[PDB]
RNA sequence: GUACCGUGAGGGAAAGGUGAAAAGAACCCCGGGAGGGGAGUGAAAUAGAGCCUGAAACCGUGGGCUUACAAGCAGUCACGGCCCCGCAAGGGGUUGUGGCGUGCCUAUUGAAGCAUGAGCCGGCGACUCACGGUCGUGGGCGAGCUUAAGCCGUUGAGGC
RNA sequence: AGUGAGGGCGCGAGCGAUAACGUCCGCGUCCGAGCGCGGGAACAACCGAGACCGCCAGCUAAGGCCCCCAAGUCUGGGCU
RNA sequence: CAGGCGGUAGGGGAGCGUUCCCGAUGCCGAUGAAGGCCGACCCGCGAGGGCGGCUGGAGGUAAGGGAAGUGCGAAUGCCG
């Protein structure tokens, strides 16, 4: 915001030399090499994305940590009740859950569990595969993860 | 004239060391031969207004 | 008695009993190791040209150590030089025992 | 994200400033000038290590050749008989020698005689 | 295992007689003496070194015609201040100078080298007054 | 046992009253009134003020006898200095400070 | 967009923080007041309003060592003395004498330089980012490799 | 990448006055960047020698060995 | 085992620390976070990192990775 003036003259005064006081020198000044709004994406290789996100699912299939279910029976819509469910699939809470489904009822029963990771076929994605230390699938989401990739 | 001028800092050491002298002396008292209160020696008493036996001014 | 020895390319006077720091050794601790003798000293006065030949000065090995750290600087002026270097001088420490000849 | 200078500099500074403790008016004082000294302090101990060692090889060789000519003789033959003679002590020794152990000394004197002539 | 020091030690007076002797090589040894350096226990930072009595010294030898060539020189920090003196005149008004001046020279400087300097006492003529301390005179 | 006193903010340059403060410094109750009544300096007055503030909270506050007061420590402290213009010939202007003190005197019994 | 500066157009600051709660210190004491000393409140007043933390330059008070025949880029190596911490041996501080000793930066054929810059301290302070190139490199696919805008989905999900 | 101000010394030439801490080339060297270490009083470039760090060990170099100051007031033989 | 390791411009290599992100609905924290002040202690060649005492009073951020407003002593620099 500052003037463009020349703060005082060039030479004969005993000062320094200088110019505007908007100079990045001066206290209030502007910034050197700053941040300035910017793009960090770009368009990593889909074949790529592809191969790493059957090869996430690999990892979590040899860990044996990958559960297929054709579907959540006792799951109406409430939390306890995928509560219920979650204990007999073994999944007592003890680790990390990934849990993809098509079926809107059964992500909203999951959801607010903090050990519980909710998505929807089309958005499975490899970063969210790594940090859950189970994978758990719709053998109707599994369909889609088949025809992804390939 | 040509406006001489320090060329170097005063050291705090080469400060004080001229300080040496500024020290006060304490003032020199006497104690009057009437009222015995401390005043300074050839004056006339501010406390009993005495000097040399006599009464001077009136305290 | 006395006796010169020789160890770590250095030579010191020792007498039984003797507490001594000295150039890093390979005995473990507990380990007594055998010095050479330069020079016997006291009431006997043998003298080595250069080693006296049955002698020994008989040591056990305290332990080994790092000195203290020698902070070793160096600096060049008009030529932006500078380099810190930090010496730990290792070490042994021996109890003289006893002197042999 | 800024990185603000924060905590750094001081940390930097403080460290120097405890090396120069001691140090006379603003060299313990002031930063720059601390450096300055420091820098100075660091040559003059590694030079300084160095002359350590020659000096006290002179300190032994003026006191073995004191000892030397109460036998009426200089520290010039009497290395040179000690050598001769294959004497391996050194000055460091030869120096204690001469004063703690007159009687020993005197001994290495009458080898360093024989043994040149 | 660390280099011997000596704990302060009681000195030794000497005498020296300096009829005849060379000027130079006289004063030459008076400072080994003052400075110690002939005792084995020597060490540089303290003074350990004899007490010098010497006695007519008025009757120093120099070789050449130094007695009447030879100048003694000093400044006074005045103008036109330097003062030159010959030999020959020194001797004849203050014959102690000339070795007390010899030796001086050949001390160290600083400190304890002018602490070394008041041990030596230079007297012109036979007499010297440390009966006292009953000088072990010396011979070299 | 001891007794403070405290005048700070005080409108007068530490050095001159400091000045004073070494007369009494030390000295008994007694001298120190008789020395500040007699010395002729400006700090004098404020120094006097707190030395028999000091008194005061000696015996009123803390069991002391006025009979064996004295000067066991004193000091001037550098308070916040009123900066002013002075203005020079040629147009120049300069900073006066105006400086002020933090007087402290603290006071004893001792029985000898 | 104020204070302030400027005839004017115009220029253009500095300044945030007690405490969970004002419970913001009645009352007594010194003092003209200011300010303090008791008291009282609070977990804390070394949170007291000039209020969180409270570094450094800078200024004092007290203590240890030291200094008035020694001349010095202020240090360093050694020895010795005193004071302190230590069972011991060991160490911290200080420095008497001895040895050695031409600041830092920059610019330079060359600087302790009588060439440059710096009173001192604290904080701000200089090789970035975009697009396009050329090499190297970690990977993916390979006679093939790859999408752009955009569309769908999400609402830190991707696909088309 | 940087460099494209070099400098001193020895030697060979031109210029100069068989002047210059002069100037311009050529061969070499060192300083530059080794103002780190020993010597030459002091002294970039002369003599010695290329410093990774430690040692209260040893041998040598140049230069030295009467005192300041480490080592011969060494030994023959001359001269001044 | 053998050899190398002076170094300005400059090239190469390996690291230290600052802010922020994932790791985190986690773990550390009033039995005291950050910051501050000491230290003769420990580790590191070093940049540093710990441990202990005092202060401080509400935050902090692991191993493994990611991103930069990332390190000051000099600009007759700027502000105080
Ligand atoms: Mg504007
Ligand atoms: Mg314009
Ligand atoms: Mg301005
Ligand atoms: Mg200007
Ligand atoms: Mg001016
Ligand atoms: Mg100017
Ligand atoms: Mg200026
Ligand atoms: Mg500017
Ligand atoms: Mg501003
Ligand atoms: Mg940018
Ligand atoms: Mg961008
Ligand atoms: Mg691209
Ligand atoms: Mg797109
Ligand atoms: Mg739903
Ligand atoms: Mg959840
Ligand atoms: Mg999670
Ligand atoms: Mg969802
Ligand atoms: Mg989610
Ligand atoms: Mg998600
Ligand atoms: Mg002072
Ligand atoms: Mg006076
Ligand atoms: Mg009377
Ligand atoms: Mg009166
Ligand atoms: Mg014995
Ligand atoms: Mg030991
Ligand atoms: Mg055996
Ligand atoms: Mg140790
Ligand atoms: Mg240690
Ligand atoms: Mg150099
Ligand atoms: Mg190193
Ligand atoms: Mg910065
Ligand atoms: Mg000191
Ligand atoms: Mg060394
Ligand atoms: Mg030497
Ligand atoms: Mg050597
Ligand atoms: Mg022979
Ligand atoms: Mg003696
Ligand atoms: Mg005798
Ligand atoms: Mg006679
Ligand atoms: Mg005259
Ligand atoms: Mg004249
Ligand atoms: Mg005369
Ligand atoms: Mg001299
Ligand atoms: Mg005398
Ligand atoms: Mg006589
Ligand atoms: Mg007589
Ligand atoms: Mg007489
Ligand atoms: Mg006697
Ligand atoms: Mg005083
Ligand atoms: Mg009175
Ligand atoms: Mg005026
Ligand atoms: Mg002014
Ligand atoms: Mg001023
Ligand atoms: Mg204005
Ligand atoms: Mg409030
Ligand atoms: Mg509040
Ligand atoms: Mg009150
Ligand atoms: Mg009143
Ligand atoms: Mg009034
Ligand atoms: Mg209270
Ligand atoms: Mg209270
Ligand atoms: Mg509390
Ligand atoms: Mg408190
Ligand atoms: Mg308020
Ligand atoms: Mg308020
Ligand atoms: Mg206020
Ligand atoms: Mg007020
Ligand atoms: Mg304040
Ligand atoms: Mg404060
Ligand atoms: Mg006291
Ligand atoms: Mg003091
Ligand atoms: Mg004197
Ligand atoms: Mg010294
Ligand atoms: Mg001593
Ligand atoms: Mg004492
Ligand atoms: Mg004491
Ligand atoms: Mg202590
Ligand atoms: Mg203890
Ligand atoms: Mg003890
Ligand atoms: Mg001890
Ligand atoms: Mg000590
Ligand atoms: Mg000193
Ligand atoms: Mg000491
Ligand atoms: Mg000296
Ligand atoms: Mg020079
Ligand atoms: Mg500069
Ligand atoms: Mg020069
Ligand atoms: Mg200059
Ligand atoms: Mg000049
Ligand atoms: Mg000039
Ligand atoms: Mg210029
Ligand atoms: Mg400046
Ligand atoms: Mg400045
Ligand atoms: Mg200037
Ligand atoms: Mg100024
Ligand atoms: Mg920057
Ligand atoms: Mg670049
Ligand atoms: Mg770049
Ligand atoms: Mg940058
Ligand atoms: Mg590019
Ligand atoms: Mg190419
Ligand atoms: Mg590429
Ligand atoms: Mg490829
Ligand atoms: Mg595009
Ligand atoms: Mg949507
Ligand atoms: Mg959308
Ligand atoms: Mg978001
Ligand atoms: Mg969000
Ligand atoms: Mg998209
Ligand atoms: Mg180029
Ligand atoms: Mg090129
Ligand atoms: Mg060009
Ligand atoms: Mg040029
Ligand atoms: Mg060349
Ligand atoms: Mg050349
Ligand atoms: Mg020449
Ligand atoms: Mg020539
Ligand atoms: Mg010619
Ligand atoms: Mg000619
Ligand atoms: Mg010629
Ligand atoms: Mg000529
Ligand atoms: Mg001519
Ligand atoms: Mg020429
Ligand atoms: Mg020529
Ligand atoms: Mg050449
Ligand atoms: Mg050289
Ligand atoms: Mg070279
Ligand atoms: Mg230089
Ligand atoms: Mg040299
Ligand atoms: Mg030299
Ligand atoms: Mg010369
Ligand atoms: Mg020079
Ligand atoms: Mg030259
Ligand atoms: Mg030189
Ligand atoms: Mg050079
Ligand atoms: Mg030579
Ligand atoms: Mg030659
Ligand atoms: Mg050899
Ligand atoms: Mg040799
Ligand atoms: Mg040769
Ligand atoms: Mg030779
Ligand atoms: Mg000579
Ligand atoms: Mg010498
Ligand atoms: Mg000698
Ligand atoms: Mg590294
Ligand atoms: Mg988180
Ligand atoms: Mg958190
Ligand atoms: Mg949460
Ligand atoms: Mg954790
Ligand atoms: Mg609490
Ligand atoms: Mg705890
Ligand atoms: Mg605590
Ligand atoms: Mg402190
Ligand atoms: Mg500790
Ligand atoms: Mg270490
Ligand atoms: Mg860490
Ligand atoms: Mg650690
Ligand atoms: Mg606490
Ligand atoms: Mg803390
Ligand atoms: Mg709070
Ligand atoms: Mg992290
Ligand atoms: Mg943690
Ligand atoms: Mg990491
Ligand atoms: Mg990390
Ligand atoms: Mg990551
Ligand atoms: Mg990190
Ligand atoms: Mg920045
Ligand atoms: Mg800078
Ligand atoms: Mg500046
Ligand atoms: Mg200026
Ligand atoms: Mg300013
Ligand atoms: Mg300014
Ligand atoms: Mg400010
Ligand atoms: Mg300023
Ligand atoms: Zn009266």
Same mark, same amino acid.
């Given at each position: 915001?500052?003037?463009?003036?020349?703060?005082?003259?060039?030479?004969?005064?005993?000062?320094?030399?200088?110019?505007?006081?908007?100079?990045?020198?001066?206290?209030?000044?502007?910034?050197?090499?700053?941040?300035?709004?910017?793009?960090?994406?770009?368009?990593?290789?889909?074949?790529?994305?592809?191969?790493?996100?059957?090869?996430?699912?690999?990892?979590?299939?040899?860990?044996?940590?990958?559960?297929?279910?054709?579907?959540?029976?006792?799951?109406?819509?409430?939390?306890?009740?995928?509560?219920?469910?979650?204990?007999?699939?073994?999944?007592?809470?003890?680790?990390?859950?990934?849990?993809?489904?098509?079926?809107?009822?059964?992500?909203?029963?999951?959801?607010?569990?903090?050990?519980?990771?909710?998505?929807?076929?089309?958005?499975?994605?490899?970063?969210?595969?790594?940090?859950?230390?189970?994978?758990?699938?719709?053998?109707?989401?599994?369909?889609?993860?088949?025809?992804?990739?390939? | 004239?040509?406006?001489?001028?320090?060329?170097?800092?005063?050291?705090?050491?080469?400060?004080?060391?001229?300080?040496?002298?500024?020290?006060?002396?304490?003032?020199?008292?006497?104690? =009057?031969?009437? =009222?015995?209160?401390?005043?300074?020696?050839?004056?006339? =008493?501010?406390? =009993?207004?005495?000097?040399?036996?006599?009464?001077?001014?009136?305290? | 008695?006395?006796?010169?020895?020789?160890?770590?390319?250095?030579?010191?006077?020792?007498?039984?009993?003797?507490?001594?720091?000295?150039?890093?050794?390979?005995?473990?601790?507990?380990?007594?190791?055998?010095?050479?003798?330069?020079?016997?000293?006291?009431?006997?006065?043998? &003298?080595?040209?250069?080693? &006296?030949?049955?002698?020994? &000065?008989?040591?056990?090995?305290?332990?080994?150590?790092?000195?203290?750290?020698?902070?070793?600087?160096?600096?060049?002026?008009?030529?932006?030089?500078?380099?810190?270097?930090?010496?730990?001088?290792?070490?042994?420490?021996?109890?003289?025992?006893?002197?042999?000849? | 994200?800024?990185?603000?200078?924060?905590?750094?500099?001081?940390?930097?500074?403080?460290?120097?400033?405890?090396?120069?403790?001691?140090?006379?008016?603003?060299?313990?004082?002031?930063?720059?000038?601390?450096?300055?000294?420091?820098?100075?302090?660091?040559?003059?101990?590694?030079?300084?290590?160095?002359?350590?060692?020659?000096?006290?090889?002179?300190?032994?060789?003026?006191?073995?050749?004191?000892?030397?000519?109460?036998?009426?003789?200089?520290?010039?033959?009497?290395?040179?008989?000690?050598?001769?003679?294959?004497?391996?002590?050194?000055?460091?020794?030869?120096?204690?020698?001469?004063?703690?152990?007159?009687?020993?000394?005197?001994?290495?004197?009458?080898?360093?005689?024989?043994?040149?002539? | 295992?660390?280099?011997?020091?000596?704990?302060?030690?009681?000195?030794?007076?000497? !005498?020296?007689?300096?009829?005849?002797?060379?000027?130079?090589?006289?004063?030459?040894?008076?400072?080994? !003496?003052?400075?110690?350096?002939?005792?084995?226990?020597? @060490?540089?930072?303290?003074?350990?070194?004899?007490?010098?009595?010497?006695?007519?010294?008025?009757?120093?030898?120099?070789?050449?015609?130094?007695?009447?060539?030879?100048?003694?020189?000093?400044?006074?920090?005045?103008?036109?201040?330097?003062?030159?003196?010959?030999?020959?005149?020194?001797?004849? @008004?203050?014959?102690?100078?000339?070795?007390?001046?010899?030796?001086?020279?050949? !001390?160290?400087?600083?400190?304890?080298?002018?602490?070394?300097?008041?041990?030596?006492?230079?007297?012109?003529?036979?007499?010297?007054?440390?009966?006292?301390?009953?000088?072990?005179?010396?011979?070299? | 046992?001891?007794?403070?006193?405290?005048? /700070?903010?005080?409108?007068?340059?530490?050095?001159?009253?400091?000045?004073?403060?070494?007369?009494?410094?030390?000295?008994?109750?007694? #001298?120190?009134?008789?020395?500040?009544?007699?010395?002729?300096?400006?700090?004098?007055?404020?120094?006097?003020?707190?030395? #028999?503030?000091?008194?005061?909270?000696?015996?009123?506050?803390?069991?002391?006898?006025?009979?064996?007061?004295?000067?066991?420590?004193?000091?001037?402290?550098?308070?916040?200095?009123?900066?002013?213009?002075?203005? /020079?010939? /040629?147009?120049?202007?300069?900073?006066?400070?105006?400086?002020?003190?933090?007087?402290?005197?603290?006071?004893?019994?001792?029985?000898?």
């Amino acid at each position: 915001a500052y003037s463009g003036r020349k703060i005082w003259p060039q030479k004969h005064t005993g000062r320094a030399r200088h110019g505007d006081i908007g100079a990045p020198i001066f206290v209030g000044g502007g910034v050197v090499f700053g941040p300035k709004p910017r793009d960090y994406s770009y368009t990593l290789p889909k074949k790529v994305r592809k191969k790493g996100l059957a090869m996430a699912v690999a990892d979590r299939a040899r860990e044996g940590k990958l559960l297929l279910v054709e579907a959540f029976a006792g799951v109406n819509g409430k939390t306890k009740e995928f509560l219920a469910w979650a204990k007999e699939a073994g999944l007592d809470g003890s680790e990390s859950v990934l849990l993809v489904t098509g079926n809107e009822l059964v992500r909203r029963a999951a959801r607010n569990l903090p050990w519980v990771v909710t998505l929807a076929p089309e958005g499975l994605n490899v970063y969210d595969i790594v940090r859950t230390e189970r994978l758990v699938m719709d053998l109707d989401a599994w369909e889609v993860f088949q025809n992804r990739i390939g | 004239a040509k406006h001489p001028v320090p060329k170097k800092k005063t050291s705090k050491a080469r400060r004080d060391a001229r300080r040496s002298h500024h020290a006060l002396t304490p003032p020199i008292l006497v104690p =009057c031969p009437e =009222c015995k209160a401390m005043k300074p020696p050839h004056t006339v =008493c501010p406390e =009993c207004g005495y000097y040399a036996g006599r009464k001077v001014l009136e305290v | 008695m006395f006796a010169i020895v020789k160890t770590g390319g250095k030579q010191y006077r020792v007498e039984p009993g003797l507490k001594l720091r000295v150039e890093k050794l390979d005995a473990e601790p507990g380990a007594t190791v055998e010095l050479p003798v330069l020079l016997l000293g006291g009431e006997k006065t043998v &003298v080595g040209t250069p080693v &006296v030949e049955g002698a020994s &000065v008989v040591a056990e090995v305290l332990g080994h150590g790092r000195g203290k750290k020698i902070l070793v600087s160096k600096f060049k002026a008009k030529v932006q030089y500078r380099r810190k270097k930090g010496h730990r001088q290792p070490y042994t420490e021996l109890l003289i025992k006893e002197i042999r000849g | 994200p800024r990185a603000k200078t924060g905590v750094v500099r001081r940390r930097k500074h403080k460290k120097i400033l405890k090396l120069a403790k001691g140090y006379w008016g603003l060299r313990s004082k002031s930063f720059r000038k601390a450096r300055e000294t420091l820098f100075a302090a660091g040559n003059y101990a590694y030079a300084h290590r160095k002359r350590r060692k020659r000096d006290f090889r002179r300190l032994w060789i003026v006191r073995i050749n004191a000892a030397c000519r109460q036998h009426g003789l200089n520290y010039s033959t009497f290395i040179h008989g000690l050598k001769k003679a294959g004497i391996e002590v050194d000055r460091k020794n030869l120096a204690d020698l001469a004063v703690r152990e007159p009687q020993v000394f005197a001994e290495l004197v009458e080898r360093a005689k024989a043994a040149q002539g | 295992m660390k280099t011997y020091v000596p704990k302060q030690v009681e000195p030794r007076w000497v !005498l020296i007689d300096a009829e005849g002797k060379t000027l130079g090589r006289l004063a030459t040894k008076i400072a080994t !003496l003052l400075r110690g350096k002939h005792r084995p226990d020597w @060490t540089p930072n303290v003074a350990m070194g004899d007490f010098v009595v010497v006695v007519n010294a008025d009757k120093i030898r120099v070789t050449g015609k130094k007695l009447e060539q030879k100048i003694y020189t000093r400044y006074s920090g005045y103008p036109g201040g330097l003062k030159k003196i010959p030999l020959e005149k020194m001797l004849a @008004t203050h014959p102690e100078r000339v070795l007390e001046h010899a030796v001086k020279g050949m !001390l160290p400087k600083g400190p304890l080298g002018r602490r070394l300097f008041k041990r030596l006492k230079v007297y012109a003529g036979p007499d010297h007054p440390h009966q006292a301390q009953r000088p072990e005179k010396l011979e070299v | 046992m001891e007794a403070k006193a405290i005048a /700070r903010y005080v409108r007068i340059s530490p050095r001159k009253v400091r000045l004073v403060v070494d007369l009494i410094r030390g000295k008994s109750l007694e #001298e120190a009134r008789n020395i500040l009544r007699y010395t002729n300096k400006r700090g004098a007055y404020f120094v006097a003020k707190v030395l #028999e503030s000091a008194a005061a909270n000696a015996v009123n506050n803390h069991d002391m006898l006025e009979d064996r007061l004295y000067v066991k420590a004193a000091y001037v402290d550098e308070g916040p200095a009123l900066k002013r213009v002075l203005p /020079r010939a /040629r147009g120049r202007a300069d900073i006066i400070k105006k400086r002020t003190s933090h007087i402290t005197v603290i006071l004893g019994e001792k029985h000898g």
